């Protein structure tokens, strides 16, 4: 409804004056409820140098339910699977209306920097993250080269 659209427009304007991390986001064409985003691989993470694309769909009752957010670029990470689904609490149970798409992107950036392996979407990636960090980082760098450059 109209409340959602007002809030989406406000968050787009907010993002343009103050970009979260090194992210971009906004409408695909004229559709205010379907956005694209990009996140630069954080410096000093194994994703450094990659550019990762995401899709975002706002619900009609935004901001009182979360946007649906998924990666379209492949990424090696304990909380992001091969469909680009993102296991992140604020996109489900911990969403509230004081969150914004800028805060979602900052939280996804932090997630890339410091995973939640006890919340595994990809059990083996979670396991290697915990038991052999040097190997996790090697493989995440390899996948950044393969998919995100």
From Swiss-Prot:
Tell me what effect the entry lists for residue 92 to A: Abolishes histone H3 ubiquitination and decreases interaction with PHF7
What is a single Pfam family found in this protein's UniProt entry?
UQ_con
Q: Quote the catalytic residue positions.
A: 87 (glycyl thioester intermediate)
What Gene Ontology terms for biological process does this UniProt record contain? protein autoubiquitination; protein K48-linked ubiquitination; protein modification process; protein polyubiquitination; protein ubiquitination; ubiquitin-dependent protein catabolic process
Q: What effect on the protein does mutating residue 146 to E have, as reported in its record?
A: Abolishes histone H3 ubiquitination
Pathways per UniProt: Protein modification; protein ubiquitination
Ordered alphabetically, the record's keywords are: ATP-binding, Nucleotide-binding, Transferase, Ubl conjugation pathway
**Enzyme Commission code:** 2.3.2.23, 2.3.2.24
Gene3D superfamilies of this UniProt entry?
Ubiquitin Conjugating Enzyme
- Kindly state which reaction or reactions the protein catalyses: S-ubiquitinyl-[E1 ubiquitin-activating enzyme]-L-cysteine + [E2 ubiquitin-conjugating enzyme]-L-cysteine = [E1 ubiquitin-activating enzyme]-L-cysteine + S-ubiquitinyl-[E2 ubiquitin-conjugating enzyme]-L-cysteine; S-ubiquitinyl-[E1 ubiquitin-activating enzyme]-L-cysteine + [acceptor protein]-L-lysine = [E1 ubiquitin-activating enzyme]-L-cysteine + N(6)-monoubiquitinyl-[acceptor protein]-L-lysine
Domain UBC core residues, every copy: 3-149
Q: Which GO terms describe its molecular function?
A: ATP binding; ubiquitin conjugating enzyme activity; ubiquitin protein ligase activity; ubiquitin-protein transferase activity
Supply the enzyme class, top level.
Answer: transferase
Provide the Gene Ontology terms for cellular component.
Answer: cytosol; extracellular exosome; nucleoplasm; nucleus; protein-containing complex
Record flagged with keyword Nucleotide-binding: yes
Superkingdom to which the source organism belongs: Eukaryota
Membership in a protein family: Belongs to the ubiquitin-conjugating enzyme family.
Q: How does it assemble?
A: Interacts with SCF (SKP1-CUL1-F-box protein) E3 ubiquitin ligase complex. Interacts with CNOT4 (via RING domain). Interacts with E3 ubiquitin-protein ligases CBLC, PJA1 and PJA2. Interacts with PDZRN3. Interacts with PPP1R11. Interacts with E3 ubiquitin-protein ligase PHF7; the interaction inhibits cleavage of PHF7 and promotes association of the complex with the nucleosome core particle.
Give the protein's function: Accepts ubiquitin from the E1 complex and catalyzes its covalent attachment to other proteins. Catalyzes 'Lys-48'-linked polyubiquitination. Mediates the selective degradation of short-lived and abnormal proteins. Functions in the E6/E6-AP-induced ubiquitination of p53/TP53. Mediates ubiquitination of PEX5 and SQSTM1 and autoubiquitination of STUB1 and TRAF6.
Q: What is this protein called?
A: Ubiquitin-conjugating enzyme E2 D2
The organism named in the record is Homo sapiens
Question: What would be the name of the gene that encodes this protein?
Answer: UBE2D2
């Amino acid at each position: 409804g109209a409340m959602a659209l007002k809030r989406i427009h406000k968050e787009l304007n907010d993002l343009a004056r103050d970009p979260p991390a090194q992210c971009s986001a906004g409408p695909v064409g004229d559709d205010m409820f379907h956005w694209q985003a990009t996140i630069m691989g954080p410096n000093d993470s194994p994703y450094q140098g990659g550019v990762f694309f995401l899709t975002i769909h706002f619900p009609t009752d935004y901001p009182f339910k979360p946007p649906k957010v998924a990666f379209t670029t492949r990424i090696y990470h304990p909380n992001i699977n091969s469909n680009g689904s993102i296991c992140l609490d604020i996109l489900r149970s911990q969403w509230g209306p004081a969150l914004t798409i800028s805060k979602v992107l900052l939280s996804i950036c932090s997630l890339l920097c410091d995973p939640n392996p006890d919340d595994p979407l990809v059990p083996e990636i979670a396991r290697i993250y915990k038991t052999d960090r040097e190997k996790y980082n090697r493989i995440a760098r390899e996948w950044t080269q393969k998919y995100a450059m």
